[PDB]
Amino acid sequence: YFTRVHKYNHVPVPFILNVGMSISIVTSFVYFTYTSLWVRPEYDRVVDPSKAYVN
Amino acid sequence: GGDAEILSYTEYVSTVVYPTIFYMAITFVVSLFLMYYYIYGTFFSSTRNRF
Amino acid sequence: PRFPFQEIPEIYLPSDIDRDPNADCWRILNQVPRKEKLLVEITDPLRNFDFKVAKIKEN
Amino acid sequence: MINNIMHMINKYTLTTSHKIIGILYGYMGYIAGILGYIISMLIRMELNTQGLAIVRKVKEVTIYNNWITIHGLIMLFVFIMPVGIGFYGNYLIPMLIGTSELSMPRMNGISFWMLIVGVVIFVISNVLMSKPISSGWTLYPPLSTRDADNIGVNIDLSLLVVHVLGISSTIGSVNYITTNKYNRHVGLTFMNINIYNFSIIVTSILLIGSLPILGVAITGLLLDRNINSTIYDVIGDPVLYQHLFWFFGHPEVYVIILPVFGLTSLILTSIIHKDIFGREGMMYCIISIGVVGYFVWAHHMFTVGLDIDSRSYFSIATSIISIPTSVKMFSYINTWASGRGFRGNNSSWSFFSFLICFCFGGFTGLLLSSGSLDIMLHDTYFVVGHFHTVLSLAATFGLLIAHYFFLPIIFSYSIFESFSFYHTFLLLVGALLVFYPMHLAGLSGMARRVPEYADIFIPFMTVGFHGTFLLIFSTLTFIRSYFQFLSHINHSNYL
Amino acid sequence: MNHERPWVFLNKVTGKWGACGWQPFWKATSQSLNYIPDNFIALRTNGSWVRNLWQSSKVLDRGLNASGYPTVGTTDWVRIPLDAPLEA
Amino acid sequence: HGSNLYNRVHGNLPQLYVEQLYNTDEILDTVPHSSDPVHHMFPKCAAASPLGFRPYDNNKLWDAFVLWAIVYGVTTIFCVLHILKYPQIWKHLFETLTFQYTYQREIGEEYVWQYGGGGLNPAKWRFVKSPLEELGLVTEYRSDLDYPDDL
Amino acid sequence: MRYGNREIESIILFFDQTIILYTSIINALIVGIIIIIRKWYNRKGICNQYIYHIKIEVIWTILPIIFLIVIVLHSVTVIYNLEINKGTNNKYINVIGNQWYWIYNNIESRISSLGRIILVDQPLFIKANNNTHLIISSLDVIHSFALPTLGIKVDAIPGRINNISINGLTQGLYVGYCSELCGSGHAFMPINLIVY
Amino acid sequence: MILNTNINYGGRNSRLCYLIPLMVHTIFLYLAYLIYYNINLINIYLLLIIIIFINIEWPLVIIYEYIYLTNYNIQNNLLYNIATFIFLEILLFIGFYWLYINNIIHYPNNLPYNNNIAVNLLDHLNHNNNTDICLYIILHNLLLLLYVTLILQLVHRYVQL
Numbered sequence A: 001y002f003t004r005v006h007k008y009n010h011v012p013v014p015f016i017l018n019v020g021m022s023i024s025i026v027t028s029f030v031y032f033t034y035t036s037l038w039v040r041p042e043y044d045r046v047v048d049p050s051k052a053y054v055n
Numbered sequence B: 001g002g003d004a005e006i007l008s009y010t011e012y013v014s015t016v017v018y019p020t021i022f023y024m025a026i027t028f029v030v031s032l033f034l035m036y037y038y039i040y041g042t043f044f045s046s047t048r049n050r051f
Numbered sequence C: 001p002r003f004p005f006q007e008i009p010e011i012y013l014p015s016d017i018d019r020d021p022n023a024d025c026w027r028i029l030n031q032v033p034r035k036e037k038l039l040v041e042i043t044d045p046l047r048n049f050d051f052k053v054a055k056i057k058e059n
Numbered sequence D: 001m002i003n004n005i006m007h008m009i010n011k012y013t014l015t016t017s018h019k020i021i022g023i024l025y026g027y028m029g030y031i032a033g034i035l036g037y038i039i040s041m042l043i044r045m046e047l048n049t050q051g052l053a054i055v056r057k058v059k060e061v062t063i064y065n066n067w068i069t070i071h072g073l074i075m076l077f078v079f080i081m082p083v084g085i086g087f088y089g090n091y092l093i094p095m096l097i098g099t100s101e102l103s104m105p106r107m108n109g110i111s112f113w114m115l116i117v118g119v120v121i122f123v124i125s126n127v128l129m130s131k132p133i134s135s136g137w138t139l140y141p142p143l144s145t146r147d148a149d150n151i152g153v154n155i156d157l158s159l160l161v162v163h164v165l166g167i168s169s170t171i172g173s174v175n176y177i178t179t180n181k182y183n184r185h186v187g188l189t190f191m192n193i194n195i196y197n198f199s200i201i202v203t204s205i206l207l208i209g210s211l212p213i214l215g216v217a218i219t220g221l222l223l224d225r226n227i228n229s230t231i232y233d234v235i236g237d238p239v240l241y242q243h244l245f246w247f248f249g250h251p252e253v254y255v256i257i258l259p260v261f262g263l264t265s266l267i268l269t270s271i272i273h274k275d276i277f278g279r280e281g282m283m284y285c286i287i288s289i290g291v292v293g294y295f296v297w298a299h300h301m302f303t304v305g306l307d308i309d310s311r312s313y314f315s316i317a318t319s320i321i322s323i324p325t326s327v328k329m330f331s332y333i334n335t336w337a338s339g340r341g342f343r344g345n346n347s348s349w350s351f352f353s354f355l356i357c358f359c360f361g362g363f364t365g366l367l368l369s370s371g372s373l374d375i376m377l378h379d380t381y382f383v384v385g386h387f388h389t390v391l392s393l394a395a396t397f398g399l400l401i402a403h404y405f406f407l408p409i410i411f412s413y414s415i416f417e418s419f420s421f422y423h424t425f426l427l428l429v430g431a432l433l434v435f436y437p438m439h440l441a442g443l444s445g446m447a448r449r450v451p452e453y454a455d456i457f458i459p460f461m462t463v464g465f466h467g468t469f470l471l472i473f474s475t476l477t478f479i480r481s482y483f484q485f486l487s488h489i490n491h492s493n494y495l
Numbered sequence E: 001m002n003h004e005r006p007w008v009f010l011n012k013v014t015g016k017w018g019a020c021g022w023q024p025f026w027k028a029t030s031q032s033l034n035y036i037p038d039n040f041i042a043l044r045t046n047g048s049w050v051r052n053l054w055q056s057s058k059v060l061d062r063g064l065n066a067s068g069y070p071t072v073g074t075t076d077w078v079r080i081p082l083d084a085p086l087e088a
Numbered sequence F: 001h002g003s004n005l006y007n008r009v010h011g012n013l014p015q016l017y018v019e020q021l022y023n024t025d026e027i028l029d030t031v032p033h034s035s036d037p038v039h040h041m042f043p044k045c046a047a048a049s050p051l052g053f054r055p056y057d058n059n060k061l062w063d064a065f066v067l068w069a070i071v072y073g074v075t076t077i078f079c080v081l082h083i084l085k086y087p088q089i090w091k092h093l094f095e096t097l098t099f100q101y102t103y104q105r106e107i108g109e110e111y112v113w114q115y116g117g118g119g120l121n122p123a124k125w126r127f128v129k130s131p132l133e134e135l136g137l138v139t140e141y142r143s144d145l146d147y148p149d150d151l
Numbered sequence G: 001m002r003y004g005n006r007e008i009e010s011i012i013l014f015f016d017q018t019i020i021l022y023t024s025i026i027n028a029l030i031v032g033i034i035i036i037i038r039k040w041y042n043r044k045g046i047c048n049q050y051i052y053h054i055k056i057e058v059i060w061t062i063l064p065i066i067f068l069i070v071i072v073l074h075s076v077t078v079i080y081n082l083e084i085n086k087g088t089n090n091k092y093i094n095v096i097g098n099q100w101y102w103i104y105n106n107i108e109s110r111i112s113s114l115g116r117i118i119l120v121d122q123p124l125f126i127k128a129n130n131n132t133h134l135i136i137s138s139l140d141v142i143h144s145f146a147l148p149t150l151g152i153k154v155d156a157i158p159g160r161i162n163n164i165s166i167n168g169l170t171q172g173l174y175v176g177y178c179s180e181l182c183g184s185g186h187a188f189m190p191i192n193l194i195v196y
Numbered sequence H: 001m002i003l004n005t006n007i008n009y010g011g012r013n014s015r016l017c018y019l020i021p022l023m024v025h026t027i028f029l030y031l032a033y034l035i036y037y038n039i040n041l042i043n044i045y046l047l048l049i050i051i052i053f054i055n056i057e058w059p060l061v062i063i064y065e066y067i068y069l070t071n072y073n074i075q076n077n078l079l080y081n082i083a084t085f086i087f088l089e090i091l092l093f094i095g096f097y098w099l100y101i102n103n104i105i106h107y108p109n110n111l112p113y114n115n116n117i118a119v120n121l122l123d124h125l126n127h128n129n130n131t132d133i134c135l136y137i138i139l140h141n142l143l144l145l146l147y148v149t150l151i152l153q154l155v156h157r158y159v160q161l
């Protein structure tokens, strides 16, 4: 017998656990991709051509 | 021994594996948020008093 | 901690440097126990330092 | 007794039986491990105390440099590969596929005795002779060719040692692949051979593809030293040497690690009384790690001056290699679940230590993959922490699992579990005290290969002192346990 | 090793019995896989002394007139051997 | 174990064992026979375990020496060679481990002490005085020893 | 507390992001392993059939990938941010790594006795907020100019002229090292930079 | 009669298990001696005689084992090992080529001479040509090796058919 074929041993995920895991993973990915690639304020530039100095 | 708790595949997956992963996901999100606040000091504004 | 440039005979110095003994440019920022950190290094918890860091436009 | 003596010598020199060659590899590996440990203790005693307390002169730091280089070479090329691949590879590979011998029985003996020749040359060159090689285990020119402390012939003898070890490894690899491909018993397909055989096959494929390049690099060094060419001189390309050496360098690392994965998987099947979770997944991940290790060699040269595009590319490739190892770690964690592993077994606890330490070392090494962040961590103690919390806590503990699982089988005497518990736990705690501080001493700027350090770094070396004492205790416990293993009782009375 | 076979102490005035024998012991270490320990308490025997003790327990507890057995020093204890079942 | 030569000669193709009366060892270089004894890996262990015995007995001097050589042999050979070639390194190690060597230590001074917590941080360190000289075992520090000048 | 440069700040922030990610992963796995071990040691939750789960395996292979592309992108951008300031300079300095001492514009710098291992008799001076180009190489063997607190660590290889761009914002003395085995006096070959 | 075993090659004890390692040891210590004292310890021709003599063992055992112990499983093992060895040789050649073309693919270079056009009549094609390379003689050698390859392939096919 091939006892690990698709038709055998399917365990559905409870809806509550499915929702909780989905929310957790989506939140984590969104938060990380945001705070890493979007909230990057050290890349600051100032546009002021009058701050040049030539003797 | 005679006291060992033996579960079938379905029972084990349903009553052990899935709740474990659920708790792990909760820990993941909570730790991400609390660690980011712990270091930078702000939840969404990067370093505190610097920007 | 400060760099002792007055104890070194015949040391080249820039013409446009401040030679006052207690100038800012003679401080030793790292590699010495200080009790007053002037540099933010990769091992410094700003939380342990209460985030008393300078602004972004300054520095 | 002349006949008996000559018969024993012929038994252990003319042999081609895989079991005998395996035990010989194991013996040589353990001996070289102990020697490397002694040299490591010398290095640690040099670091712990202040004021060049052992060499006593700045001019004589060449002794310390020789210590570090021979420590590295001994522990890499004569401790792990002979044990991980030579010992269990020869002893088990024919048995696990149901066959008598390896293919090419004579080349197996040739491999072992090439290893012994290399060890002999190395030991004579670096002990009985004066002013030995002192250029770190990565023999970077022009330091290893155009220097003042490296002029003797024994340096060239050490390079030839590297050559013989390469020859031995190539022979062993070819033999393992060939035996595993054609001698399988009827009804066993190539991808149904157990996990250890597959990992050995991929390791052998790794060794075959890279060793000739290392041979080319070493021949370049020898030619520069002897016939006075200029391949690696001020008008040469020391970076070319680095490229070749490190093209060999990382495949060697994965060659070291993978057989430990195979052995741990096999032993787990034997002690948890359950099959491997996702065996096909683990085998595919092993081959993936093997293949991806051939495209990442230059993550060891981020500060040499590589092109910016190449820096980015090699950071990318290192992350790619990081993925499948994570898959394997998760597979292990799930394998142990639902099983009935023995609750009081040094094999079980050594497996736990292996898993934890490998995860931590993999993370720390994944930090180093980023080219930019490798600016601040190249040639500090962070790299030392990394490759010692992988080599000396994941490879060593995997071999401890194998050692405590296969001693009863080979010898037929059970294991003194309390003794082994003391040994393994003190090795764990002592080693962590030695290497963990290194990490935070690397982020603080302490360079490596220095016998004398600035006063800012005292606390890390104090914790290292503590760890070194615990390590001495653990290794003495281990050796005395083994001596007690093969010795009959010493006390007996009437109660 | 060769010591005495297990015996039975029996105290007369108190009328109380109990088995006994010589227990070898050694410092603990690794065992051997291919060896099941032989009979060490009763050397060179098929281990019948357990059966003899079990059979003789009812005889001894019921009250035995063991005046025909040797004593142990100057005490009130006598030795009964367990070579053969005791009936009296 | 015991030779199987009688069976080999009375076997089925005895001509194959004519070489066995030349200068030739039976176990290593003779054609194996259907009824040969089974040879084990570690014959000493194989013969001792079923009798309950560990292969080596410490009470026998020969066995004690053999086991010492097996376990501690090359280790002590390497140590002896190293000590013969580098007498000064072990001399210095002995000096340091016995408190005979002090780099620049003085009398009555206090020195910084910190266990962990990253690099030297003045808010965590202590200062320690030498208990040896607090008791009285030390009054002056030896100067005849080698000194790492220019450091 | 100032940062001493912008490149060091960027590297530090990238480091902090990776640290947060790895700590989160470690905490998740620690909770999982705690549950598993607590169940195991008490002889609970046994199932010899549980040796395969297609969905779980696919998901646990996918998840590390998505969280890794972000790290890779951030690292690449940090590299290029390190390397943009080239070409906007007005001062050039050349550095030679000799055998256990440094040379700046043909002026030698060796360790001194006033400081134990950190201080030097002749520092290297650069002006604050002024972009400078360092042309680094070596005469005898390979050294490594290492000032990791300013985000500079470049090997001085014989016959190979490396070219890095250095910029200072905080005035003071930065201590650095050789960060590459070069001989006996490797541990005593320090670097001193003064931003004034 | 004779009791038949499995199809694998059982394995024989042989002196080649240590002679080849001793030969390598001898070669390397001989080279060390020649490097140190600038004079050979023993005559090079005697050394080569020893090396040749030790290695005549392989053909003898080859003949006597093909006469007795050979089947298709053994033949396949041998052929696969040959393939792996040829792969190793190809890799060695690739490595040496790497060590050769390294400083030729990086076209810009520092040269003692001038290689800019319009200063002399033979300077533009200076850096771009290494004239002393024995061109048409190398061509003749290539023709010889092509002869050998094609002849051998033709004869191999002819005998196989």
Ligand code: HEA
Residues within 6 Å of the ligand: D030, D033, D034, D037, D040, D041, D043, D044, D047, D068, D069, D071, D072, D073, D075, D076, D079, D080, D083, D136, D137, D138, D384, D388, D391, D392, D396, D399, D400, D403, D427, D431, D434, D448, D449, D450, D471, D475, D478
């Ligand atoms: C597998 C390789 C391996 C192993 C096992 C070790 C083991 C140890 N190593 Fe090292 N090490 C290297 C590989 C290894 N090392 C390399 C490649 C370098 C770099 C060389 C260079 O930089 O050029 C290096 C450099 C290095 C340094 C560099 C110092 C300097 O550069 O500044 C230091 C100092 O702290 C050190 C310490 C130790 C210690 C204290 C141990 C051990 O004491 C801790 C663990 C000890 C064990 C107990 C293992 C001993 C094994 C046996 C006990 C055999 C018994 C049998 C088995 C269990 C199978 N190692």
Ligand code: HEA
Residues within 6 Å of the ligand: D138, D253, D254, D256, D257, D299, D300, D301, D302, D318, D319, D321, D322, D323, D325, D326, D327, D329, D330, D358, D359, D361, D362, D363, D365, D366, D367, D368, D369, D370, D374, D377, D378, D379, D383, D386, D387, D390, D391, G025, G064, G065, G067, G068
């Ligand atoms: C001994 C075995 C071994 C192993 C397995 C590794 C694995 C890795 N190593 Fe390393 N390494 C060495 C041995 C090893 N290494 C040695 C000896 C040196 C020093 C040579 C010397 O300089 O002398 C060295 C040096 C070294 C450097 C040198 C840094 C420097 O010198 O500049 C770098 C940097 O790129 C590096 C990176 C890696 C990476 C990225 C992995 C990755 O394979 C790690 C992957 C592991 C995992 C990732 C764990 C699984 C993680 C999870 C469970 C999920 C998390 C996953 C994601 C979020 C994606 N290693």
Ligand SMILES: CCCCCCCCCCCCCCCCCC(=O)OC[C@H](COP(=O)([O-])OCC[N+](C)(C)C)OC(=O)CCCCCCCCCCCCCCCCC
Residues within 6 Å of the ligand: C045, C048, D440, F115, F116, F117, F118
């Ligand atoms: C509530 C009590 C907390 C734990 C008590 C012990 C730690 C004391 C306070 C810790 C913070 C201040 C650091 C000073 C001391 C740190 C000691 C240490 O291990 O440092 C390494 C490391 C060094 O890292 P660290 O201290 O730099 O941590 C980072 C700190 N900041 C936030 C400032 C950046 O210390 C730690 O990891 C801290 C926790 C240590 C707890 C150890 C418990 C396990 C014990 C294992 C065996 C150790 C044997 C030691 C025996 C000593 C006595 C006999």
Ligand SMILES: [Cu+2]
Residues within 6 Å of the ligand: D249, D250, D253, D296, D297, D299, D300
């Ligand atoms: Cu690598």
Ligand SMILES: [Cu+2]
Residues within 6 Å of the ligand: G097, G100, G142, G143, G144, G178, G180, G181, G182, G183, G185, G186, G189
């Ligand atoms: Cu240097």
Ligand SMILES: [Cu+2]
Residues within 6 Å of the ligand: G143, G144, G178, G179, G180, G181, G182, G183, G185, G186, G187, G189
């Ligand atoms: Cu240096």
Ligand SMILES: [Mg+2]
Residues within 6 Å of the ligand: D378, D379, G144, G179, G180
């Ligand atoms: Mg370096």
